[PDB]
């Protein structure tokens, strides 16, 4: 059936906008997956899992009796897809079990270890996610082997259809670097937003890059691709040491014997994919990567035989029974169980990214630390594995259950405890008036209130106006956040905030996160008086104020909002269009499309542009609230060029006379362009729209304000 | 930017089934069309709509100083979608304005006559639709012009994204027959259900089949394609006649000038197409379908001269500027004014298609009826017009305003009035229990009620249990129907209500209608008493019984279910999966993923199956309300392989034993197959889902009783 997307490949797509509705979710509309949570029996569950590691299934048996590999294996592919750049992928979501992830090639088999789960899952129902059960089994599998877990968080709900992901350009799995549609150029850089070599891979191509088995070369790409997943070198040698500590890869026979991913499969293989004609196809017969490596002797217990293997032999090129390329001790004795026949035994085995452990020199300094002190192994694995697979969770206050870890740790953007009675609603009156008072503009409120609270994104639930980080390194310097503008602004909260707090009896106070919030909810509610119109912004108290030293720096990096339609700021030229960097921004703040077409059309007659641009400010009236910018936007009396200088700027001028009215952006233009968000804008633009467009508006700018706010939750 | 439906291109899509949701709506939750409809000035908007008839715009001069041909054409391109195989396309959702018939070769230059209302649009907001707009627009020129409409009903809710249709396979606008993608076979058969000839035309080529201007073969596709659209050779005649007694073709020039359609437009474009490099692009110069004819010699004014000179000149075959094939009249003098020049003056033309209504043997018997008596002519287009741009707005009951047809007509498959008192609960209760008195079966309850029920489509809001007609022909005789046992049922039925009604006080009566969906009612509460659970299942009464006279069976056999899903039948062997074909019948029922997984999940073990037919009733404890279906399903104790005499029969045999369990067809399966269904019946296959499943359950069941209740909106 030819599609709009066939007629127009390149036209904007809003469907990333409106997935996940209540049309497809299950659950009721007032389903509460944390009230849900907080009542299940965890130690039960975790009894129930702890018993499936050694019970064995004929249609996938456990190598050595023990699915504990396999299932750790399932918790890191889960979380391991997750990138910094742009918070998407992780396991907080459980896309696992979503197209395209339930059928990547590095996912092969794992289709096996979710339906291991099935009956624990349906003994649980909705009071455990798959979400939480895929990392909580991970948990088990460690405890169950010796292994003491650093603790686990519930909370992760459940979605009901595939999150929409740039996981790069390729059209063929696997494919090597160099291509048509390369995810790099230049000296091995790797296009961002993507974290891993290849598609269809977590991070590295275990044979080496591009299936170079050279150890040295395979340690750069490890470093690039776990240094993209938010891990450092400590993390990085812990994760992958630790993991590999346990079970075994498999690679029995050629890969030619494996069959269709699941999403490829028949309608009989009942969501199971990669049926092997290979003898049994499974167990001792088992193909998932092809190669055919066990890393201990003991891989179904904890050990530090992972690092005495590693630098205790010298290793030799060898190859898999597929043929992919893998490294053997050939002086070793026969130490290694095989995982079905007590008779034989087996040499030690390692993977060519095991080896840059070793052979990469900043590597080798961690892994000989951790070689020869295994308790600071064991210590590094479970704080990495608990960042690993709770890295996308959100702020702590989204922790549920009773094993939460109290050790507030640096990568959670942590937030200091209230301790003190909050302002209430005459109070908030009270400093809205004071902030009027001050002289600091709509524009000024507006602004800084948007750059503090729309760092928020939801694909990681990290950013937002909480912790008053806009006032610390970096983000008081980022160029969209108009640093010199900023400072002046804060300054005069700073003096509102003191002058307040000063003043107070009996503990309350008020937090600059707060009242940064609170003086552009001010501002919103001026511009509405500056257009004839009373109204009150919610605004809901209890954010607490971060130290610098409660601020990761490096981390924060991948906040800054290089792309911001919504103040009509590019910080260079990119290849992808500036209105489809728009959609991906309202994505990331959990936007709809009429959201985003409200909101953006609000903030232009604000004053909310970067340096005060006039693109798109289609009003006589800045700093009042109207509807404005659809009305003159969708004014056929206005015709519009791109300018001879800038291609992505355009003119509007008069019809009749030729005379110039307006200048706008790509970003502007599109809502006069493209034939869904016309239609939006259409209902906004009309005359009976002055009402509905001020209260849609207050409601997603309050919508904004809120993103991070668990607290409230 | 690869995608799912890239790598998996043939995987099922779901996506139209959460189409249309709250997240694409700018309108409030409550926002109700038909309240601010009641409220519009009607007879204001159509002042103004008289008044733009003669405004002109430099933009996009109106022909001979009047907009009203280019209207007219608009609405009957709005309108000219519809397909009665699935009730899809029409004007009753304004598509015309979104993608891709916003941008169809055939809606040329509509793009300018839907900008020429914005003002209007704007001016009314949200209490007119655009949808209403363009029919009520078309409906103004044809008075403005002089002539007397048969009347117009509002209630045409806006929509806010395209509607995924298939409208071919064609990979190329205007793709003449016999190509890869072909949608004919045969002796010029056109593929159901599609109802035009070419990939972006509304019906037929105006130059003739496949650009060849025979007008004899030309009536073949004519009479196909309109019949399609659920028109008779009468309405033909008179639609085709009266819209060209208006207005011209545009094709001044060759169409190499003419540039990107709306949806390929730069964004400066805002939102329109077709942009000419002809001279001055527009009015006299301007170009849109190639063609360059105009019928009459009064454009703007009701005549008789279509007819006049279709009879009354020999017709010699042409070219356009553009050259395109068309017709000028032998010998004429030069009678057409120029639209405008008013010193030229002009031959009179046709296309080859409007020498169809005298050419085939057929239509020129009712041309030439029309052209002796043209108060028949204008009786009939008058009427046809209302059936036109009416014909997919359902029951009568959704009509609004104050220019609503008195007259009932057999198209709109008509309810009589409820002129008595409806049963109370009481008498439902006592229904109920004579129903289940009678020895009815749970199977033969929920059968019955389904099949009544389940014709509706919202496409076109045909069909649905008002109307009891599934007692009459053709209904009562479809396969699918079951029409023995069905036979068997009403007669039970029949008796209880003629008992019923003969001991009732005063006028209180049930109608067949409403006790065949309370019988359905009375069987799941059986069910549901049968598995241990107290239930009750809503009805609302108030439905009427139609006559067979009511009731044109030519026109109903559009609605038989030649496949449906949720009684596992497909009537014969299609190419579409039978997975395609049930969300597709999901679709038209208005259902949602979740509703339509718990519905069949709920009528397998209520024996709904027609035949009786074991495949997917996966409970040892049929006719009990369970979730049995899912729990059943989802157990990885059994494997599932296809059947060596039937590839879509699989047999689901103990993992261990071998034993024969179930027997189940992809329509089963998919459920446990596809990624996103079978997360759904995990949600009802869990062990604390077992109310959940039986209140949704409860609750789509109604929702399907109830789906043509325009009468309780
Ligand atoms: C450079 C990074 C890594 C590479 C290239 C990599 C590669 C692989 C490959 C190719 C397999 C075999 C798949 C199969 O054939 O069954 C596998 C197994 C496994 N990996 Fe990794 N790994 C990486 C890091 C990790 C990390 C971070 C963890 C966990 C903290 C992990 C835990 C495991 C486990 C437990 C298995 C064994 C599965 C079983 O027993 O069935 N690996 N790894
Ligand atoms: C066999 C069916 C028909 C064919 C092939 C057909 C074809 C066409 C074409 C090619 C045009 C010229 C478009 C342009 O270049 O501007 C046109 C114009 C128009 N048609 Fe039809 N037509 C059909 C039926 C109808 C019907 C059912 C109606 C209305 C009841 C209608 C009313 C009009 C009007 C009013 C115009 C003039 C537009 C203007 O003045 O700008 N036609 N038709
Ligand atoms: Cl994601
Ligand atoms: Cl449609
Ligand atoms: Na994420
Ligand atoms: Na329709």
């Not at 028949?266 to 196809?281: C, M």
């Amino acid at each position: 059936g030819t599609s709009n997307r066939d007629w127009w490949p390149n036209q904007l797509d809003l469907s990333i906008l409106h997935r996940h509705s209540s049309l497809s979710d299950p659950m009721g509309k007032d389903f509460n997956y944390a009230q849900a949570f907080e009542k299940l029996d965890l130690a039960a569950v975790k009894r129930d899992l702890h018993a499936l590691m050694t019970t064995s299934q004929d249609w996938w048996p456990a190598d050595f009796g023990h699915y504990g590999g396999l299932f750790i294996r399932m918790a890191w592919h889960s979380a391991g897809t997750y990138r910094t750049a742009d918070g998407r992928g992780g396991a907080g979501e459980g896309q696992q079990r979503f197209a395209p992830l339930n059928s990547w090639p590095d996912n092969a088999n794992l289709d096996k270890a979710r339906r291991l789960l099935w009956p624990i899952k349906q003994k649980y129902g909705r009071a455990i996610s798959w979400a939480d059960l895929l990392i909580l089994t991970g948990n088990v599998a460690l405890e169950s082997m010796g292994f003491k877990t650093f603790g686990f968080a519930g909370g992760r709900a459940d979605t009901w259809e595939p999150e929409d992901v740039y996981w790069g350009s390729e059209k063929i799995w696997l494919e090597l670097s160099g291509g048509p549609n390369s995810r790099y150029s230049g000296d091995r850089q790797l296009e961002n937003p993507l974290a891993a070599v290849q598609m269809g891979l977590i991070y590295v191509d275990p044979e080496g890059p591009d299936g170079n088995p050279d150890p040295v070369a395979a340690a750069r790409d490890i470093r690039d691709t776990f240094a993209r997943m938010a891990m450092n070198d400590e993390e990085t040698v812990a994760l992958i040491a630790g993991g590999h500590t346990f079970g075994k890869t498999h690679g029995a026979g050629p890969a030619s014997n494996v069959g269709a991913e699941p999403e490829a499969a028949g309608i009989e293989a009942q969501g199971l994919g990669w049926k092997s004609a290979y003898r049994t196809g499974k167990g001792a017969d088992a193909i998932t990567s092809g190669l055919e490596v066990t890393w201990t002797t003991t891989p179904t217990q904890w050990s530090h035989n992972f690092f005495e293997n590693l630098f205790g032999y010298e290793w030799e090129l060898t190859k898999s029974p597929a043929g992919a390329h893998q490294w053997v001790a050939k002086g070793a004795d026969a130490v290694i169980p095989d995982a079905f026949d007590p008779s034989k035994k087996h040499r030690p085995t390692m993977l060519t990214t095991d080896l840059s452990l070793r052979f990469d020199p900043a590597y080798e300094k961690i892994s000989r630390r951790f070689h020869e002190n295994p308790e600071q192994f064991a210590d590094a694995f479970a704080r990495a594995w608990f960042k690993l697979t709770h890295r996308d969770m959100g702020p702590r206050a989204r922790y549920l259950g009773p094993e939460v870890p109290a050790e507030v740790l640096l990568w959670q953007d942590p937030i200091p405890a209230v301790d003190h009675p909050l302002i209430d609603a005459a109070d908030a009156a009270e400093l809205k008036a004071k902030v009027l008072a001050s002289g600091l503009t709509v524009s000024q409120l507006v602004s800084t209130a948007w750059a503090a609270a729309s760092t928020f994104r939801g694909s990681d639930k990290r950013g937002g106006a909480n912790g008053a980080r806009i006032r610390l390194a970096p983000q008081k310097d980022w160029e969209a956040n108009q640093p010199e503008q900023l400072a002046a602004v804060l300054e005069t909260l700073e003096a509102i905030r003191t002058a307040f707090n000063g003043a107070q009896r009996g503990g309350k106070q008020v937090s600059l996160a707060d009242l940064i919030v609170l003086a552009g909810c001010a501002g919103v509610e001026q511009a509405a008086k500056n257009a004839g119109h009373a109204v009150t912004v919610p605004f809901a108290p209890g954010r607490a104020d971060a130290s610098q030293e409660q601020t990761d720096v490096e981390s924060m990096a991948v906040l800054e909002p290089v792309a911001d339609g919504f103040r009509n700021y590019l910080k260079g030229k990119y290849r992808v269009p500036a209105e489809v960097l728009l959609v991906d921004k309202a994505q990331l703040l959990t936007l709809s499309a009429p959201e985003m077409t409200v909101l953006l059309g609000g903030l232009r007659v604000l004053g909310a542009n970067v340096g005060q641009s006039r693109h798109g400010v289609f009003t006589a009236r800045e700093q009042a609230l109207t509807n404005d910018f659809f009305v003159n936007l969708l004014d056929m009396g206005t015709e519009w060029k791109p300018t001879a200088a800038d291609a992505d700027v355009f003119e509007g001028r008069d019809r009749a006379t030729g005379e110039l009215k307006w200048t706008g952006t790509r970003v502007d233009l599109v809502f006069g362009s493209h034939s869904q968000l016309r239609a939006l804008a259409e209902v906004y633009g009309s005359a009976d729209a002055q009402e509905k467009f001020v209260r849609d508006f207050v409601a997603v700018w309050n919508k904004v304000m809120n993103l991070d706010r668990f607290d409230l939750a």
